[PDB]
């Protein structure tokens, strides 16, 4: 019944049954935005909204094969997801040893995709045999780059020129690092189109990815400058100058995140034996394809077979933000003759703008964390922060050179 | 545990048996991947094995992998597994898309990104709704071919734009598959390289593999009409496959699609809590002019890469294809009697999807596209559940650009 | 001695004497104080040199110093050609000089090419890379295609609408139907499978087609309007914004010109033996190729360049567009090239170099092309005017040229920079 | 009268005689016997237009029609600023009408601009956006930014080699010994913050600084190349590749230039009252900013533009720069602009415009600015030369001017579209 169903809530919501929640939801007693809570499990939740969107499918056993017990909603609800229904599981792979600066690296690689795991692995024993790969970080510094509006572009003219000044670049610097503890402001950089001013505030970020807090800094430097110009407009705290999860030169020349660079040397005899091809067969497919076959297609930062592949792979598995492989997998690789009889294949990848993370996202949940831990870089650096995110930047970078070696070899011997 | 020699069928040996069996070095590691027997306990094996090398063996504790399907992975989707990585699973809508409701599911471990294209639904519901249609199919594979000289590749350009060379090479290519149907073919010369962009229809796959071997047979018939062209590359980069390029957001690769929808200066007011006069300054000055000052190509958008993407691991499909598949460029206008409500639009040229194929063969994959009704083939209508998923695509990602460019905007 | 207005003015509205009859200080005090504007100087005027003298007389008291002009020419100039057509308000002219480079060595042909330039080495090195292709067997080149384009953006009322012209246009009598009104225009219209966008309710559409050896913007813009206006028939709400929407794209950087082409198509080649490469360049093919690499493909790649893989194409393309009477407003696009060298030959010590300009905007009638002194430079490539027997035979000529002649350039700028200065 | 071989080398190679004694006929004949090479005319002539003449003979009847040179004039040109400067091989010169679109009223002053075109109307046209800005209150400017660019590229053994020679760069005592070296070339050379990139073992390094008035060139390239042997004494394993690695950019396009800034970046804006949008421009306020929104912006976004969003900023740039000597090549890049468009005012009926052109290359000394013609166009602007007590302000102000005059011919070329017709 309905009415005595009403009064049990009252005195928990644990006493009542899935249906006799649903009878009071359906039938509209109480509103459907407040079971979040009442409800104590929250395994419970899950079911209870997957059987009210189930009553809205034309198929509603389509849910059936769509997993959600056992999992650990815990660090997820308030942090990760709404409205969530259960989880997708995504096939885990290891491509490995990875032999990069002196340590060897098992990498897990979450994709559905049919031999590009195995693919990565051969050019991971490639690069093996050959002595391993060097990288080394760049730059590292998360950015955000908001638009504001000035009455006209010679007040925005100003404005820049005052930022560009010592002293007001000090003054910006102040506000954006009060905000958070790794919140440390790199030299900014302005664009005007007119009265519109864009301003690309960059920072280090500890081991996080750092959106969250550039935001915050990003905001309160805002506000400084908006006590020193009141007539300035904040239209969006994002302006598209960043530029976050959409292609754009400026991530490609400027960097953004870490920029890194990997590079490895591999034997004639390595690439006969076990990439199946030749040195020669191999720095011309590199020319003609990720050179100039991106230049043909019109390519900005695509210069490479399929760094997206590997970068997706690990960042799924890693607890990355997976939308951020628009512009992490910007890539040029590079191949020319090496050694002393020049039949040996020098490789390098460059990778400017690997936007990551060990903390905070999807690295709080656990079995993002185990990826994370297989890599020895879970969780902040205690003594050196950025330390964990910086090494897992060169691990993408030297996964992604393994990948570029094996798919390229693969295409060079036909 | 029992002696080495005793042991040396698989079923009936303990865990520990084989693992001494191949710590003593009786037995090469990568042979256990054919005689054991079962693949969850393949699974076990490996992740043991692995565990020892690793300079924390406790790290694996909680990556899950009893009681998944590995009969549909093995062979596949992934090799080396050691378990999988379960991504939490929201639900945005209802999303009223051409006369129908979708509940659209989206993985994701960005908070507030399900509840962001939740509100944006809301919005184009109180709206009427949103209408779209696919403007283009055909997905591509661009290799590279060199020939001696670059008059000799100028030859084969002028050949393969007769109707009689482009006729024998669609008979080619159309003999590999049922839906293999070349649509015309896009050529660039850089000097003795010839550039050619093979595009056909693929029914309701994704249409990577299926275009592939299309490509190869099209090209062993032009090597008849010309033997001194060398295939330097099955892919020359001009497809252009998971990089950045202009060519997909100029000439699309797969589903190109447009969606549209006017907003109500009432429901942009309460739903949405700014004006139509302000998202508008916003999207101007942020997805135009902002986008071109960065110096983008195709990202004329807020952040339709946050929707594609959660969609495509939520309903199998390849994430890595994001890259060309969240080229988006979102308009805003005044609309209506006083131009207070809000006409907004979304084109997508190159979304690259498919309810066949790959991920979309695991089962709790199917059981999103199931949600939507686009799960497998369509026999009536070939293409049909695939061009359907693309529409919510697009959709959903308008949804999501209204929802965002409105916080903004406030 | 100059009469009061009033009487200057019966002189002037005197059919039987008009301006001619005024002193050069009497029409001057005219236009002081009103009665004649300026814009009517020169449709009163006997002739045109008089008119740019008064021009300038009027335009020296204005300047704060009134000598400016003084090294500035303007007399004897063949102005009847350039009068409401090629300029306006015209103070005089400015000479540039023009060197040659040649011969170029190009489809068993030689040319000696004309080039306008105030840069100094700048003809020396093309004429330079001239005399390596020269001993070096000669150069080859091809037109791959053929058609200046317009990209007009128009509007439907819905997204749903502009779907709907899109597709219509996609089907063959629908295509038909506004070929027939484009091709009517003019002669040498002939519309080629159209491209189209959608940006929501907005619909570019370039229309592409040959101009004969017009560069063919007028022409194809005709053709344009015409097209749209059999469009609207059967889509009576849809609005016409702008005849040209920056889909073309005219004068602008835009990859859609760098992947479709606009205007004339074009690739050069040259083999130049090890033994050319060193007493003619200086250098070695390693050495060439080499920077071939990391900076015409690498260095362009991390400069983010759409279309620029080449050492400097523009400086060629410029100075023989400026030579003749091109629009050199148009060196944006036409300059467009990627550069390729690779290693061949005996013991890989032969230069296989090439040059593709797939949107070389270039015409051999119409524009400064009319004008006798640039027509000059057109004859002594052969390739003046229109060609009967055999139209876009000269502008493709030229195309052809001027992809040799930047593969010329690209060879000498490459090999000093393989030397270390 | 022609003379034996050996009769004519010897008064030519006598002192106090000279090629003066020879006929035309006669040094015809030495240099198709090949005694003497043809570029070597340039030294051995006494007059420069003689040598011009002979060259042009040799040309003539090397060519299928031998009478083509008829219109190509050279007689009465001063040759002198020119041999050994700015041309070589010289045949004659081009005449490029010039026309005057003003007054442009641009920060409270006014500016008679020249322009050198072919192009039909568009003079008439500039000159039209010109009279709308002035009646509008005038227009303003601001130059944001000041520095030449040269980007060589150097390698490394390996990539991690290059990451060091990066990191050391970036320290602000690695710096200050690579400034101290670049700034003991020139007293204007005063280098800014270094931009570099990596790719794999090669290192792109962007060297940018003022130039006084110059262009600036040839003054960052000696910079560069003391920098480049300065930062060889620490890295002793560095091979310089180029002295452009094609990351400057120049003379192609790249997003660089558009980002970053190249030469003079420039704002300029102006509010046009709506009476003025109106009777001057045929049109309205709400028409122009649809057009500017839907050509501009998203017709050049859909084109796949960088650097673009304007409609035909580069015909007022390419037709400034051969008036005022300028190096039309790099119209490329400084033709760089997007032109912005709103309502403004109480009513918001009038029309708010601005342009921004972030890569200017400009000069008021150099190459073509040293010949008379072209410094009569510098003199018309004010901005000749070298500005004695602010260096680099002629060539800012050129900028500015440049900025005003593209604007004036978007408010224009819009306005007509907007329109119809
Ligand atoms: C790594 C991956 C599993 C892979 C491989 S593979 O791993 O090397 N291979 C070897 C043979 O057995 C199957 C597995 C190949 C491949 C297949 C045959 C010949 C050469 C290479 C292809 C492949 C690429 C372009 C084709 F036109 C068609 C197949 N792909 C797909 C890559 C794909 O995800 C991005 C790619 O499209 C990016 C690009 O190169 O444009
Ligand atoms: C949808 C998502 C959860 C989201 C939201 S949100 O869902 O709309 N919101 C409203 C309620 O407050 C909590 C979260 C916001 C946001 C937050 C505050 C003000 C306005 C908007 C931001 C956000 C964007 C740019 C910022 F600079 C900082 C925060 N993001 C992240 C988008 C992000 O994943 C791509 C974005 O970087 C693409 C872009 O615009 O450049
Ligand atoms: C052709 C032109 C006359 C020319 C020449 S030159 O003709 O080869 N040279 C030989 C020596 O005597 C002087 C004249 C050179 C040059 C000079 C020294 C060493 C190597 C080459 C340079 C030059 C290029 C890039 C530099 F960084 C610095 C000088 N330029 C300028 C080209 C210029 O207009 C586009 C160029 O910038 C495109 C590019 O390479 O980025
Ligand atoms: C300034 C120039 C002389 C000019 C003018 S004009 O000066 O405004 N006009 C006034 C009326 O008398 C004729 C000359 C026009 C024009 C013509 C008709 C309607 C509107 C404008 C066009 C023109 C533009 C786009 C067309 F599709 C076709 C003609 N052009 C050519 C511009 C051209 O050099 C770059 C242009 O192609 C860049 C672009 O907009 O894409």
Redesign the interface.
């Known amino acids: 019944p309905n009415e005595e169903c009403l009064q049990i809530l009252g005195n928990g919501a644990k006493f009542l049954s899935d249906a006799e929640i649903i009878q009071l939801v359906n039938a509209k007693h109480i509103p459907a935005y407040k079971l979040e809570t009442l409800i104590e499990t929250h395994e419970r939740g899950v079911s209870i909204?997957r059987q009210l969107?189930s009553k809205?499918?034309?198929?509603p056993s389509?849910?059936?094969?769509?997993?959600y017990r056992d999992?650990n909603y815990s660090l997820?609800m308030?942090?990760?997801?709404?409205?969530?229904?259960?989880?997708?599981?995504?096939?885990?792979?290891?491509?490995g040893?990875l032999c990069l600066d002196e340590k060897?690296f098992?990498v897990?690689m979450?994709?559905?995709?049919?031999?590009?795991?195995?693919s990565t692995?051969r050019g991971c024993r490639a690069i093996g045999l050959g002595g391993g790969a060097?990288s080394?970080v760049?730059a590292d510094g998360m950015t955000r780059?908001p638009?504001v509006?000035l009455p006209?572009?010679?007040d925005s003219?100003?404005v820049?020129?005052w930022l560009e000044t010592s002293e007001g670049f000090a003054v910006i610097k102040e506000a954006f690092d009060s905000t958070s503890r790794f919140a440390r402001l790199q030299?900014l950089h302005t664009?005007?189109?007119?009265?519109?001013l864009?301003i690309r505030f960059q920072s280090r970020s500890g081991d996080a990815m750092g959106m969250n807090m550039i935001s915050k800094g990003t905001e309160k430097a805002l506000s400084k400058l908006h006590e020193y110009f009141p007539e300035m407009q904040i239209?969006?705290?994002?302006?598209?100058?960043?530029?976050?999860?959409?292609?754009?030169?400026?991530?490609?020349?400027?960097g953004r995140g870490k920029?890194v660079?990997?590079?490895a040397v591999i034997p004639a005899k390595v690439v006969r034996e076990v990439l199946k091809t030749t040195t020669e067969a191999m720095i011309?497919?590199n020319?003609?394809?990720?050179?100039?076959?991106?230049?043909?297609?019109?390519?900005?930062?695509?210069?490479?077979?399929?760094?997206?592949?590997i970068?997706?792979?690990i960042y799924?598995?890693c607890?990355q933000?997976?939308?951020?492989?628009?512009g992490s997998?910007?890539c040029?690789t590079?191949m020319e003759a090496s050694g002393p009889t020049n039949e040996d294949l020098?490789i390098?990848?460059?990778m400017?703008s690997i936007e990551i993370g060990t903390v905070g996202?999807?690295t709080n949940?656990?079995?993002?964390?185990?990826?994370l831990?297989?890599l020895?870089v879970?969780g902040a650096c205690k003594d050196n922060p950025g330390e964990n995110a910086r090494q897992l930047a060169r691990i993408v970078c030297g996964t992604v050179m393994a990948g570029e070696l094996s798919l390229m070899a693969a295409?060079?011997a036909?």
């Open positions: 909204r969107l809205k499918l034309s198929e389509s849910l059936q094969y769509l997993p999992y997820v308030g942090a990760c997801c709404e409205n969530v229904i259960g989880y997708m599981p995504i096939p885990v792979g290891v491509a040893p060897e098992q897990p979450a994709t559905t995709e049919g031999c590009l795991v195995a692995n060097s080394r760049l780059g638009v509006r006209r572009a010679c003219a100003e820049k020129a030299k664009s005007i189109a007119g009265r519109n864009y239209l969006a705290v994002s302006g598209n100058y960043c530029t976050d999860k959409k292609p754009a030169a400026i991530n490609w020349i400027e920029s660079v990997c590079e011309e497919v020319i003609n394809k990720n050179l100039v076959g991106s230049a043909m297609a019109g390519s900005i930062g695509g210069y490479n077979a399929h760094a997206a592949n970068v997706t792979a799924i598995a607890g933000d997976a939308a951020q492989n628009v997998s910007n040029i590079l020098y390098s990848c460059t400017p996202g999807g949940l656990l079995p993002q964390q185990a990826c831990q297989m020895g879970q295409l060079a036909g």
